[PDB]
Amino acid sequence: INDHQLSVAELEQKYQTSATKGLSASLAAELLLRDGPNALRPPRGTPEYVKFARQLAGGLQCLMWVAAAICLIAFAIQASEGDLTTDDNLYLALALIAVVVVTGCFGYYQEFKSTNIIASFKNLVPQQATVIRDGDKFQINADQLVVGDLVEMKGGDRVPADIRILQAQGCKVDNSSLTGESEPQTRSPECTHESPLETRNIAFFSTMCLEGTAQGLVVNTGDRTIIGRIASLASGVENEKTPIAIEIEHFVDIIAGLAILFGATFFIVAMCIGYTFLRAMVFFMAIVVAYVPEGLLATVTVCLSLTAKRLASKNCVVKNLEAVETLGSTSVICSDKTGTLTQNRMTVSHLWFDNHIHSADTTEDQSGQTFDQSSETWRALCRVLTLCNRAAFKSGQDAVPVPKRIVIGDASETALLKFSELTLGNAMGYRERFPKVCEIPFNSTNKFQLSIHTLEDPRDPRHVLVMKGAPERVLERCSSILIKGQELPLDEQWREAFQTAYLSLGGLGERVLGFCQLYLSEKDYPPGYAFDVEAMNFPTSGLCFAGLVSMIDPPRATVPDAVLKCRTAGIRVIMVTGDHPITAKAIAASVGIISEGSETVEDIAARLRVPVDQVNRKDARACVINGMQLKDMDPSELVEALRTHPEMVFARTSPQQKLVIVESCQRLGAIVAVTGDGVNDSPALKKADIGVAMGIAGSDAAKNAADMILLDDNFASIVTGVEQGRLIFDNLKKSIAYTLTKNIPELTPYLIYITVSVPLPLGCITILFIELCTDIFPSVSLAYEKAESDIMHLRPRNPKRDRLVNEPLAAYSYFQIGAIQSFAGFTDYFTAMAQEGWFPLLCVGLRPQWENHHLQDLQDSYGQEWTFGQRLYQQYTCYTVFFISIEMCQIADVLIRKTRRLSAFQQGFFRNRILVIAIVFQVCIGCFLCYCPGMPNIFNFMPIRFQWWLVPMPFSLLIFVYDEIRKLGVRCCPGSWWDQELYY
């Protein structure tokens, strides 16, 4: 703050530098050594293996790692007793490890590809600078700048350091990145403001001198720059866990609790039966492992990748898989204005002529409503602003869209030339034809631009005088005016209307520019005579006014409808900007952040002509908060103000204040999305649950801090993102239910085997084939399901009450569908045993004799005697038949998981072609696993008879019918006990 306030003399003694001579070369070198390079320090402490390790870590990943460790410890215990058939422990352990590793590799590949796609926009620049040393002006590198160096500035420079201007003549710079100000700001030595940002005598690091020349001293370098301190603040921000990760952690907690309960109860059962304590411990570990799915993580990752691919089809690049859901659960969108909700380019917005305010089209693609252009007054005004303008187009562009086409000159000149090229077709060629015999540019005294032009018509060479300037200076120079296409004298009513129009157009934040013309006849001025600028032979008064043209940075074409759709989705939209409150409020009204009929306390005070003390705050729905007012506030008042006003706009907010707003919104218990394009948004972007950075208009810091990037700079991609997030939430919970339901069928045979001592119904290899091969595809195909209701009308989900997996889902999947599948499998198992010679009663307690290698003549129910190998082949037959029962039940299970509430007849059985292909694939893989030569040797699968394929089919139909009746009952009685308890 002392950098700008101090005057020349004390700065000389403070920095040991001369305002003219400059810093000494030896002093400059020693100060460069002491302070260091001017370049901002880039953090580079992100190794590749660290990222891979992070991708290998997470809730489901830690659960699977602990399951593998438990398998290894149980195998160690079994080896301590010298037991047999322990290779299944390794099979399960390596299965879990391989799944975790492949999933981590896939996620790392996705992140690496996204980073490479984003990195194409980076572009280094040497950024040379002009400095005075030893009295000889020359050039150095950007980092070579040292504090106190006397440095020159000219149009098109990048301002390689923070510099206090000591001399300036019409210098205009843009601070749309560091600050939120879209309009170019003047840099002048004169200083009155306390804030370094608003102060006019200082320049900033990541800026650009649009026009003018200047010279000043270097106040800060390196990471002490404003951009440097912003980057340091962003580095201080710490990322938090994404909502989907929290849901996964809650689900893993549920799984672990249920596993511990079942393991403990059956361990006590194993004590009660008479098993050895070590055997009961091994059974405990087996149950705990059996409650841990390993193919679930792969399906979750595949669903996330599919949603990310759908988003990337629409130029939405997510840097991580978990970010594709966050927008779906977002409750608050904090939006930057300049460059995010607006185009960041000045353009013509309104035209006041003929006592009428017409609105021009401001969309970058020219897809908006046009104004009336069948007036000769419009033709006169068009000639006026066409001939006055001096900006020129960049060469080589004829197929480039006009709004994006490159123009050289002032921002106002660029906007006027673009407006002419839109209304006209070839104003660039139109300007050349008219000769500029007299041309007077903008002057500190004249405060206007003047041009004398000769007419195109050979018959009429009458001179035309066109002037462009500030309305408060232009109006006093006029006597007549174009009205209805005629010349009319100025009365008091016309001046009153001019003042009202000027005040109204200035109340929208749009700069108002006045235009006028006059006709010089050949009697007054001969055609061959040349006009002289210094002679001032012109009347310079009594002019004929044309109209007013007001220019403002406009919203992007798709912004208003996207904002409206987000509001109908229950997401509250807050605008935060570093711009002036007038422009912020006008933009918020334009884009629908402030709804029509919603007025602020200032508007109410103006309406009732009452001081704000008696004005009731609750009457006003909209609210605009300045940065100073925010600083005066305290967190309790800020929370109360957030709750009180549904529509709220923050203007003149520093990066720290945006960070605090995001922190308050998050601390209130809401999921916050932050949209940004500039470095001033990077701290809040990193603090947000999801940060969305503009791609074309975004800066490096904003893209780095953000989770998502919009490559086409389409704000409408946010509504697609939130729709996809809600859809992936619903489809993910459906897929999780489908995957979970088959745990109980795989585990129940082990419980029965341990307790009742029947021969083992299901083996570990069959369980691996179920988990890893057959059922991955149908659960993934469940992610292509369409929404049952309309996604947009619904409110954002409550993060606390609405969970991804809750008790109703787990209870239903585990203990109703899983119970039915277990019963089907056991029915088919007993059918297979009885039809081969082993009645159900004989199977009870037969395990010790069944597994005894010394018994080669065990008798069945018919008295036939079996060897160990034949009994083992019967066991493999049981494995196969129970596996087929599970698969047949899962075919109906995926169909019931298609919808949570709607009937399967209401939706389509065949509308999801991927689901049909998945079911066909599952049937084919099962058939191949059964009837392939040599199968019983490698994988314990046997060619079974067709009768055992049909035994579980009634149970599949039972699952379908039961789920359909449940959903019908839920639909019929929305608020009943059945809906409350039986809906998941």
Binding site: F815, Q816, A819, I820, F823, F826, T827, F830, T831, A834, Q835, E836, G837, F839, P840, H853, H854, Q856, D857, Q859, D860, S861, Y862, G863, Q864, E865, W866, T867, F868, G869, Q870, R871, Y873, Q874, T877, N937, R945, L958, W977, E981
Partner: protein
């Protein structure tokens, strides 16, 4: 807890009813299964494509059958002798009263139940048909002189026919070293060591509750002493196959023998 008492009891009753309905469905399915199966003949003999072969006495060593004993010390073969007496107790005339004399010398087919309590006739086998290795007059079963007797028993399968061409025979021989040394000499009881054809087919426990497996005792006469040998005994029949690597006991039995001197 998270639910009121009424809600908890309502959901508990609902789950109890659901599980009762599922249990009833499962019980009905198992009852229908039990009602369809035949009590006399297996429906789908699939892993019983060839009978297994077992040996008495059976001591299984580490992994497979391994018989060893000290000829000087009687305690070593005392257990094997007890095993042989215990097995042959079942094939005693007191335990063969239900069965009847049987000299048909061919497949003793039975299409009807003409035996007491609606059963079928079973042809009797008595231990005395083993003669020398029956336990009389040698209770040691030849173990005392280093000439052990081993009983080979073929597993019974319902309605399984070994072959009409010749009664199934048993053939014992060295495996590791057949060519080396003199060939193994074995004396069989009954003559030629054949299973008589009137013991087949088996009709099941229900049809033939007193059915008794035919026995063949093989006595080894020339076994080197203090040397480990491997002896394989196969069943020669038309429909009995012994080429199954994944089941070493199918159609044959292999055992290690070591007669220490």
């Amino acid at each position: 807890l998270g639910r009121t008492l009424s809600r908890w009891v309502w959901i508990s009753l609902y789950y109890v009813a659901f599980y009762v309905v599922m249990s009833g469905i499962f019980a009905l399915c198992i009852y229908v299964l039990m009602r369809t199966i035949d009590p006399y003949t297996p429906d789908y003999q699939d892993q019983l494509k060839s009978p297994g072969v077992t040996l008495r006495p059976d001591v299984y060593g580490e992994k497979g059958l391994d018989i060893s004993y000290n000829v000087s010390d009687s305690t070593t073969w005392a257990g094997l002798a007890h095993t042989l007496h215990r097995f042959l107790a079942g094939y005693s005339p007191a335990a063969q009263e239900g069965s009847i004399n049987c000299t048909s010398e061919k497949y003793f087919f039975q299409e009807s139940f003409l035996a007491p309590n609606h059963t079928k006739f079973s042809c009797k086998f008595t231990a005395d048909m083993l003669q020398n290795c029956s336990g009389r007059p040698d209770p040691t079963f030849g173990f005392a002189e280093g000439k052990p007797c081993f009983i080979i028993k073929m597993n019974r399968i319902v309605k399984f026919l070994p072959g009409n061409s010749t009664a199934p025979r048993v053939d014992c021989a060295f495996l590791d070293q057949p060519r080396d040394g003199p060939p193994l000499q074995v004396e069989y009881f009954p003559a030629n060591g054949t299973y008589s054809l009137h013991y087949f087919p088996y009709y099941g426990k229900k049809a033939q509750p007193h059915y008794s497996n035919p026995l063949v005792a093989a006595k080894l006469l020339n076994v080197p002493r203090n040397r480990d040998v491997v002896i394989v005994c196969k069943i020669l029949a038309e429909h009995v196959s012994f080429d199954n690597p994944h089941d070493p006991y199918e159609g044959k039995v292999e055992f290690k023998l070591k007669i220490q001197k």
